[PDB]
Amino acid sequence: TYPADLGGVDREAMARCIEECLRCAQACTACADACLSEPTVADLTKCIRTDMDCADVCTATAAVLSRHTGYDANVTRAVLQACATVCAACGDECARHAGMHEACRVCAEACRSCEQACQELLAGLG
Amino acid sequence: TYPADLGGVDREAMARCIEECLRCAQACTACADACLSEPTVADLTKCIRTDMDCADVCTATAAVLSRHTGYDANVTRAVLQACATVCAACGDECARHAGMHEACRVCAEACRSCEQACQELLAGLG
Amino acid sequence: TYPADLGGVDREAMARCIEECLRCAQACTACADACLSEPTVADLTKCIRTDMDCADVCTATAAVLSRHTGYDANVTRAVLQACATVCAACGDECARHAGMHEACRVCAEACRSCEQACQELLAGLG
Amino acid sequence: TYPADLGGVDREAMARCIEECLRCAQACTACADACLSEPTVADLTKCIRTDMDCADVCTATAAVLSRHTGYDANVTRAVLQACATVCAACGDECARHAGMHEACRVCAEACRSCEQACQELLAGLG
Ligand SMILES: [Cu+]
Ligand SMILES: [Cu+]
Ligand SMILES: [Cu+]
Ligand SMILES: [Cu+]
Ligand SMILES: [Cu+]
Ligand SMILES: [Cu+]
Ligand SMILES: [Cu+]
Ligand SMILES: [Cu+]
Ligand SMILES: [Cu+]
Ligand SMILES: [Cu+]
Ligand SMILES: [Cu+]
Ligand SMILES: [Cu+]
Ligand SMILES: [Cu+]
Ligand SMILES: [Cu+]
Ligand SMILES: [Cu+]
Ligand SMILES: [Cu+]
Ligand SMILES: [Cu+]
Ligand SMILES: [Cu+]
Ligand SMILES: [Cu+]
Ligand SMILES: [Cu+]
Ligand SMILES: [Cu+]
Ligand SMILES: [Cu+]
Ligand SMILES: [Cu+]
Ligand SMILES: [Cu+]
Ligand SMILES: [Cu+]
Ligand SMILES: [Cu+]
Ligand SMILES: [Cu+]
Ligand SMILES: [Cu+]
Ligand SMILES: [Cu+]
Ligand SMILES: [Cu+]
Ligand SMILES: [Cu+]
Ligand SMILES: [Cu+]
Ligand SMILES: [Cu+]
Ligand SMILES: [Cu+]
Ligand SMILES: [Cu+]
Ligand SMILES: [Cu+]
Ligand SMILES: [Cu+]
Ligand SMILES: [Cu+]
Ligand SMILES: [Cu+]
Ligand SMILES: [Cu+]
Ligand SMILES: [Cu+]
Ligand SMILES: [Cu+]
Ligand SMILES: [Cu+]
Ligand SMILES: [Cu+]
Ligand SMILES: [Cu+]
Ligand SMILES: [Cu+]
Ligand SMILES: [Cu+]
Ligand SMILES: [Cu+]
Ligand SMILES: [Cu+]
Ligand SMILES: [Cu+]
Ligand SMILES: [Cu+]
Ligand SMILES: [Cu+]
Ligand SMILES: [Cu+]
Ligand SMILES: [Cu+]
Ligand SMILES: [Cu+]
Ligand SMILES: [Cu+]
Ligand SMILES: [Cu+]
Ligand SMILES: [Cu+]
Ligand SMILES: [Cu+]
Ligand SMILES: [Cu+]
Ligand SMILES: [Cu+]
Ligand SMILES: [Cu+]
Ligand SMILES: [Cu+]
Ligand SMILES: [Cu+]
Ligand SMILES: [Cu+]
Ligand SMILES: [Cu+]
Ligand SMILES: [Cu+]
Ligand SMILES: [Cu+]
Ligand SMILES: [Cu+]
Ligand SMILES: [Cu+]
Ligand SMILES: [Cu+]
Ligand SMILES: [Cu+]
Ligand SMILES: [Cu+]
Ligand SMILES: [Cu+]
Ligand SMILES: [Cu+]
Ligand SMILES: [Cu+]
Ligand SMILES: [Cu+]
Ligand SMILES: [Cu+]
Ligand SMILES: [Cu+]
Ligand SMILES: [Cu+]
């Protein structure tokens, strides 16, 4: 897909990462809201905050990875590393409420899946 | 899905609107980039600008519509009206390059589909 | 600033609206976080949700209003109306906690100021 | 500002980084639009693309850095590294058009300033 500098990149891995980022951003926005409406909250504040970060970073990553013109591997690697890191953190935080709140079980799966997609694409941008 | 103030809302129409916004934001980000890489551009500048607006508004609309806690129909109606309006404008602009650039044919379909989803949900929030 | 279609627009009002949107988005992001950390919360859930919507819409509005190329008054009016409406809603919600939480007093002022800037610019785009 | 895990962080450096991210996001959005309207473009396509990435990452970074609740230094470091990297890339790209287009001179200064603010805050999160 387009420039020589993106020669040898897995276009399927790029497509999977973009779809995973958009699904994971929406999952995290939905999960921050679901935790907000739980008669519990108070105990879910780090979870809500991490959901908000994870939605913001997945949104930005989906946009950066969607652009081929004037591709810069340094920018793309740094953005993928940020998204991998926040997805890992948000997956772990949501998994802690997997039994207390069904929304966090589903969101934990979304974060873990997007973490894997970012890591797989990052590993191939050498 | 959650509060009494969202009694009588079509949850399926709400879900379709959220998925359409995320697919249309990514379609418009991809199309701004595709037009940027076209040996043409120069003639595609309004198209690129409208793609950027349409991605920004679809992103915001997907997030607002994903939230049920403390739902406010005035805010939701105003955001859906904005998204309907920009999707209409971006659909028309991309359709003009439908024969010159395949990306704009696909993006025009995305904008028209998301315009319909916003209008259908807006009509039922009375 | 640029096209004939933006002839007769107040460039100072446009600049004030953009700066107000960015200051108000950050104020609302900060206030959602401040309410999240308040030993209270539980009672601040509509406030947090409205802060999140208001940040998302102010962010999108700042970007749309920053663009002059292929200006479309219908899109700009609809986006300003959405931002005015959410700033009004978020200003009212934060003002309710003005005495309980200092963050919401400061955020209420930010929302009211950005509401005024959107309304003033909207009134002149006839 | 709030949790023990943010003990020893420079609150002034945190505030400067947030303001720099919001000013730099708007500078880059404005510069992508300014390059789009330049009778040149064609030659400014990498510049426009990098402006779009830099606006998206600065927007996300401003939001993440605005949140104190459940602070995670790994997430914050990774996001600051991404923002530093894209600001460096966008500063260099805009500087190349500093003499051809006044918008890119002003945007290059914005990118360089925000790069410095991210690097200074990152260095102190050890
Ligand atoms: Cu991704
Ligand atoms: Cu993601
Ligand atoms: Cu997510
Ligand atoms: Cu949640
Ligand atoms: Cu949660
Ligand atoms: Cu959560
Ligand atoms: Cu998450
Ligand atoms: Cu994420
Ligand atoms: Cu991502
Ligand atoms: Cu991620
Ligand atoms: Cu999570
Ligand atoms: Cu959770
Ligand atoms: Cu949860
Ligand atoms: Cu969760
Ligand atoms: Cu998640
Ligand atoms: Cu989550
Ligand atoms: Cu994720
Ligand atoms: Cu996540
Ligand atoms: Cu990912
Ligand atoms: Cu990814
Ligand atoms: Cu939608
Ligand atoms: Cu849409
Ligand atoms: Cu779209
Ligand atoms: Cu396009
Ligand atoms: Cu186009
Ligand atoms: Cu376009
Ligand atoms: Cu579009
Ligand atoms: Cu859109
Ligand atoms: Cu939408
Ligand atoms: Cu739309
Ligand atoms: Cu379009
Ligand atoms: Cu087009
Ligand atoms: Cu096109
Ligand atoms: Cu298009
Ligand atoms: Cu489109
Ligand atoms: Cu389009
Ligand atoms: Cu659309
Ligand atoms: Cu669109
Ligand atoms: Cu829509
Ligand atoms: Cu919609
Ligand atoms: Cu504004
Ligand atoms: Cu605003
Ligand atoms: Cu605000
Ligand atoms: Cu607050
Ligand atoms: Cu609040
Ligand atoms: Cu609030
Ligand atoms: Cu607010
Ligand atoms: Cu706002
Ligand atoms: Cu605004
Ligand atoms: Cu507003
Ligand atoms: Cu508010
Ligand atoms: Cu409040
Ligand atoms: Cu508050
Ligand atoms: Cu508030
Ligand atoms: Cu506010
Ligand atoms: Cu507020
Ligand atoms: Cu506001
Ligand atoms: Cu507000
Ligand atoms: Cu405003
Ligand atoms: Cu405004
Ligand atoms: Cu910053
Ligand atoms: Cu920045
Ligand atoms: Cu910038
Ligand atoms: Cu520029
Ligand atoms: Cu440029
Ligand atoms: Cu540029
Ligand atoms: Cu830039
Ligand atoms: Cu930036
Ligand atoms: Cu930044
Ligand atoms: Cu940056
Ligand atoms: Cu730049
Ligand atoms: Cu440039
Ligand atoms: Cu320029
Ligand atoms: Cu520039
Ligand atoms: Cu810049
Ligand atoms: Cu720039
Ligand atoms: Cu920057
Ligand atoms: Cu920049
Ligand atoms: Cu920075
Ligand atoms: Cu920074």
Q: What are the DSSP calls for D74-108, one per residue?
A: HHHHHHHHHHHHHHHHHHHHHHTTTTT-HHHHHHH
As a whole number of angstroms, the distance between CA D39 and CA B123 comes to 43
How many domains does the structure of chain B reveal?
1
Among the partner-chain residues C32, C33, C45, the one whose CB lies closest to the CB of A41 is: C45
- Looking at residue B67, the DSSP 8-state letter turns out to be -
Q: Which residues in chain A have Cβ-Cβ distances shorter than 8 Å to C30? A: none
**Which candidate, B62, B40, B36, B68, places its Cα nearest to that of B51?**
B36
CB C34 within 8 A of CB C103: yes
CA of B104 to the centre of ligand 34 (A): 3
Angle between helix B102-123 and helix B73-95 axes, rounded to 10 deg: 150
CA of D103 to the centre of ligand 31 (A): 26
Main-chain phi, psi angles of C66, to 5 degrees: -75, -10
The nearest alpha carbon in chain D to B33 belongs to D49
- Expressed as residue numbers, the domain containing B104 is 1-126
Tokens at D31, concatenated:
């510069």
Residues 6+ apart with CB under 8 A from C20: C113, C114, C117, C118
Helices (H), C1-126: 11-36, 45-65, 73-95, 102-123
For residue A4, how far is the Cα from the chain centroid?
27
Alpha-carbon Rg for chain B, nearest whole angstrom, is: 15
Tokens at B18, concatenated:
């959220």
Alpha-carbon Rg for chain C, nearest whole angstrom, is: 15
CB contact under 8 A, C60 and B64: no
**Which candidate, A18, A9, A10, A117, places its Cα nearest to that of A72?**
A9
**Which candidate, B84, B126, B118, places its Cα nearest to that of B13?**
B118
CB contact under 8 A, B41 and D37: no
Among the partner-chain residues C2, C26, C63, the one whose CB lies closest to the CB of D29 is: C63
- Looking at residue A98, the DSSP 8-state letter turns out to be T
What are the b/e assignments for C7-28, b being 16+ CB within 10 Å?
eebeeebbebbbebbbbbbbbb
Among the partner-chain residues A37, A41, A52, the one whose CB lies closest to the CB of C41 is: A41
Find the largest Cα–Cα distance for chain B: 54
Alpha-carbon Rg for chain A, nearest whole angstrom, is: 15
DSSP, collapsed to helix, strand or coil, labels residue B102 as helix
For residue A58, how far is the Cα from the chain centroid?
4
CB A91 within 8 A of CB A31: no
As a whole number of angstroms, the distance between CA B124 and CA C66 comes to 33
Positive/negative CA dihedral, D119, D121, D125, D126: positive
Experimental determination technique: X-ray
CB D13 within 8 A of CB D120: yes
D contact chains, 3+ CB pairs < 8 A: A, B, C
Which helix (DSSP H) or strand (DSSP E) does residue A11 occupy?
helix A11-36
Determine the length of chain C: 126
CB C114 within 8 A of CB C20: yes
Resolution in A: 1.3
As a whole number of angstroms, the distance between CA A6 and CA A70 comes to 10
CB B80 within 8 A of CB B58: no
- The position carrying tokens 């028309």 is B92
Tokens at A125, concatenated:
């941008």
Which residues surround the ion ligand 24 when the cut-off is CB under 5 Å? B 31, 34-35, 103-104
Chain A residue set in contact with B, beta carbons under 8 Å: 2, 18, 22-23, 25-26, 29-30, 33, 36-37, 55, 59, 62-63, 66-69
Determine the length of chain D: 126
